[PDB]
Amino acid sequence: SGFRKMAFPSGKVEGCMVQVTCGTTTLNGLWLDDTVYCPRAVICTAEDMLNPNYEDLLIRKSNHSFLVQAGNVQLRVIGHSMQNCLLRLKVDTSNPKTPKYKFVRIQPGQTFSVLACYNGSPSGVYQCAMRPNHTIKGSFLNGSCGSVGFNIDYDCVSFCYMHHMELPTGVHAGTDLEGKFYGPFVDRQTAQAAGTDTTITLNVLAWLYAAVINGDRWFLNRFTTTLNDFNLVAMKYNYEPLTQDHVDILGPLSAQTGIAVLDMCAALKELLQNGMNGRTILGSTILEDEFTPFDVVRQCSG
């Protein structure tokens, strides 16, 4: 073995978490430099949630309306403005613990770490993937609104997600740090549900490569397959169709281990059709798909 669902060290994010309160509603906010970011939902009361008019609701607020606190210290809000589904509150103090950072919008299939928070205080960290249907299978209780998803490239934090809500299907929906939702969802408690989800094919192959590089090799075979035939099978089991771009990405992992991507596809195909018959691949009993090629390369060498 030797393969774990690793999350990024949360320290740099922890130092940016704060509590933002408006009226009786409270949730988390990101404190970077002299600005605090939080879901504009904080300004909605129970009833407002059914069909809020954010323009309407915000214009009735002043800076005094926002109670932002860092631990047990009231942070003063000297300005406020709305950007899509987020609110940018200006505070009269700069957060010294502010790390080097970037706001990026990730693509479905990509992975990121989540720092679950409540009342602006850290509760736990976990790694997860942005499902193909734009939702996320998170362990998000309620009040977690405002928690952020992120990646850490060296000492630069790339914020990619800000939690917003839980969908009736049991999964979660959020936005990037620009306020744009990931998926066809809105800041409103109404009938909603993401499109059909699929297994992330690119990741599963990276995972199987991880097992091979880590010694496991039982699932390989002499069989062969073309890109199209592999897709015709994969589509039957609800896997994302695999493009030439996905196989080229698996190039590094291919060189190492010396297994051609299509051959690896030949192994997965057999796997999809015969379960594992009691066998485990890298400790697991199911095809894991929350590991990107980059993740795998990072964990087996970095």
Binding site: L27, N142, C145, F185, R188, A191, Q192
Partner: peptide, 8 residues
């Protein structure tokens, strides 16, 4: 049967 904006 409805979305819940998980605020506290």
């Amino acid at each position: 049967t409805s979305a819940v904006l998980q605020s506290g």
